[PDB]
Design brief:
binds adenosine-5'-triphosphate; 6-stranded mixed β-sheet; neurogenesis; 8 helices; 2 domains; alpha+beta; globular; Phosphorylase Kinase, domain 1; two-stranded antiparallel ribbon; Transferase(Phosphotransferase), domain 1
Amino acid sequence: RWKQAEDIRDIYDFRDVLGTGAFSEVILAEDKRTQKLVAIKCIASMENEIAVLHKIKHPNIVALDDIYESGGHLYLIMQLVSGGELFDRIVEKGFYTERDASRLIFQVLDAVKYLHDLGIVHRDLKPENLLYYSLDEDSKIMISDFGLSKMEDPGTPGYVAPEVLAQKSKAVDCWSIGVIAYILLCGYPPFYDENDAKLFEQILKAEYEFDSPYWDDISDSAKDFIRHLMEKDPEKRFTCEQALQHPWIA
Ligand SMILES: Nc1ncnc2c1ncn2[C@@H]1O[C@H](COP(=O)(O)OP(=O)(O)OP(=O)(O)O)[C@@H](O)[C@H]1O
C-alpha cells in the first residue's frame, strides 16, 4: 500500500536525468517541502524489490525513502548518490592498487554480510551496480539495484556463479564479489571470449587464471582471497564472514 499522487510534480521538482535502465529512468529531483535533493527511480518482482528495500538500513546501501503511485508509474524516492558507478572509475583509472581495492571490497563485504544476515541475497552484484556516494576519490561505495534480489524462505554473464548457469543462496553473491575483486586488481574480467557459447562454457567449468605477467606481482594473499570466493563448489566457497577475516581484507 503506497501513497497516491495526482501529480508527482506537485511534490517533487524534477531536474536532470541521472541515468536510465532497461525498464527505468532515474531523475534528480528536489523535495519541495524539505528542499533536499533525492533520486527518483521511475518505472512504467518490483514488489519483491520494494519489500527487500524496507528491511534494509546500511551506510553502504542506497536507501528507499518512500514511493508514490501516479498515473500508472511507480516513483521510488531514493537516497541520492553523486559519484557515478564503479564501472566508470575502473575505466578512468585502469585498475586499482591492492590497498584501494581492499578498502572497497571491505565496504562491499560489510554491506552484503549485513544483507545475508537478514536472509537477503542480491544476485546481481557488479561494478555497474556499485555506486559511489561522491565524486571525491575517497568516497564510500554504495550497493544498488535490488531488482533481482531474493529473500530466504523458512543475471550479467561474467559475474554470475557457475551453479546459476547450470540451472536458474548466499554463495551466489560471494562469487560475484570475487570477480569484482579480480577486475579491480588487473583491469579486465576473469572470463573473456569473443564466442558467447565458449564464454558460457568458461564460467560453467569455472576455469580462470591469474595469468602472467599481469598477475606477477599481485600478492599471493590477494590471489588466495580471490580463489576462495571464486570457488567452484558452493559448499567450499567463502562466506562474507570468512572473506572479512582473510588477511587481505583485515
Ligand atoms: N540513488 C541513485 N542516485 C543517483 N543515481 C542513481 C541512483 N540510482 C540509480 N542511479 C543511476 O541510474 C542508473 C539506473 O540504474 P539502476 O541502478 O536502476 O539499474 P538499471 O538496471 O540500470 O535500472 P533498472 O534495474 O531499474 O531497470 C544507475 O546506473 C545510476 O547511474
